[PDB]
UniProtKB/Swiss-Prot annotation:
Name of the encoding gene: GSN
Residues that bind Ca(2+) 7: 153-154, 176
Entire protein: shown range: 439 to 768 of 782
Name used for this protein in its record: Gelsolin
Residues that bind Ca(2+) 8: 256-257, 279
Tissue: Phagocytic cells, platelets, fibroblasts, nonmuscle cells, smooth and skeletal muscle cells.
Length: 321
């Protein structure tokens, strides 16, 4: 897609069985608990065009997903069947969708709406993980405001009732720092800038006390062989290993298989709780083989992941499974 992302867009959120307009002043901000529809009208190389992006937040329920399916069939038909359709889950957005918000980062809040509970209110202390990919696309994902949630590879924003902080990992890029600044503008708070290793007492206090967090040599490295995740499985009748692209999300770890995370200087073998013995044995064999064609191999179990592993994921919830 060569279009520059500056065409007219409309964004609706799924609320029960309806789609409901989102405040246009907040375009680029989404609730991870919800599902959205973006109708993007553009003009490129002489001709007009249309795309519908169906965006699914990582905590969106199965009924929201079914309701957007009907809602998109309705929109498609209202428009005469003219648009290009594309389904997208959180963290796997193509470049073109990321460009729609004017160089701003996509911001993803905790919470959302449901038929039962309505619109959740924002917490009074919130933490945001700001990560950008090789190509400069930036995502700011809200997580639980604990010290353990930090990782040296990224920038973070911390907003309390009384103060705001912009924490900067040793490994954080300039695109991640810029993105944190833009989140801070949307939050209407002015930051105290904080480098990793020289945090003020107020920063730790606001996170609930100082603690160990997600770090390693590789996570700390600025230079960036950026890490690769693989799914290993014998569910089809034989053992195979395929790559999982896009941002590393916790949903990508298949709980009935074994996963390999290659951070170059190390290889993690994550073992799903419903994976079979043979999947782990063969994955250990394949990792060892891949390494020797040119390094610790660390085995980790679902629910008992060390911080060196978890730091590579964009958002982690300890009560996800
Ligand atoms: Ca929801
Ligand atoms: Ca980073
Ligand atoms: Ca399996």
């Amino acid at each position: 897609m060569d279009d520059d992302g500056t065409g007219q867009k409309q964004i609706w959120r799924i609320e029960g069985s309806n789609k409901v307009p989102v405040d246009p002043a907040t375009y680029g901000q989404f609730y991870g608990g919800d599902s959205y529809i973006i109708l993007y009208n553009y003009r490129h190389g002489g001709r007009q065009g249309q795309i519908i992006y169906n965006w699914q937040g990582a905590q969106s329920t199965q009924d929201e997903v079914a309701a957007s399916a009907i809602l998109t069939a309705q929109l498609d038909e209202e428009l005469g069947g003219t648009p290009v359709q594309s389904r997208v889950v959180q963290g796997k957005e193509p470049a073109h969708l990321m460009s729609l918000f004017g160089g701003k980062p996509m911001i993803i809040y905790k919470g959302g709406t449901s038929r039962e509970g309505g619109q959740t209110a924002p917490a009074s202390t919130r933490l945001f993980q700001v990560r950008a990919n090789s190509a400069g696309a930036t995502r700011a994902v809200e997580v639980l405001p604990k010290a353990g949630a930090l990782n040296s590879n990224d920038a973070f924003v911390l907003k309390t009732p009384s103060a705001a902080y912009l924490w900067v990992g040793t490994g954080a890029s300039e695109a991640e720092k810029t993105g944190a600044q833009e989140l801070l503008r949307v939050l209407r708070a002015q930051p105290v800038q904080v480098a990793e290793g020289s945090e003020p007492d107020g920063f730790w206090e606001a996170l609930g006390g100082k603690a160990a967090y997600r770090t390693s040599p590789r996570l700390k490295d600025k230079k960036m062989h950026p890490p690769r995740l693989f799914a290993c499985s014998n569910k089809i009748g034989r053992f195979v290993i395929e790559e999982v692209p896009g941002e590393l999300m916790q949903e990508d770890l298949a709980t009935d298989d074994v996963m390999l995370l290659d951070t170059w200087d190390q290889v993690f073998v994550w073992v799903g709780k419903d994976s079979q013995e043979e999947e782990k044995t063969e994955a250990l064999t394949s990792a060892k083989r891949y390494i020797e064609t040119d390094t610790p191999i660390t085995v980790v179990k679902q629910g008992f992941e060390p911080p060196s592993f978890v730091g590579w994921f964009l958002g982690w919830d300890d009560d996800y499974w």
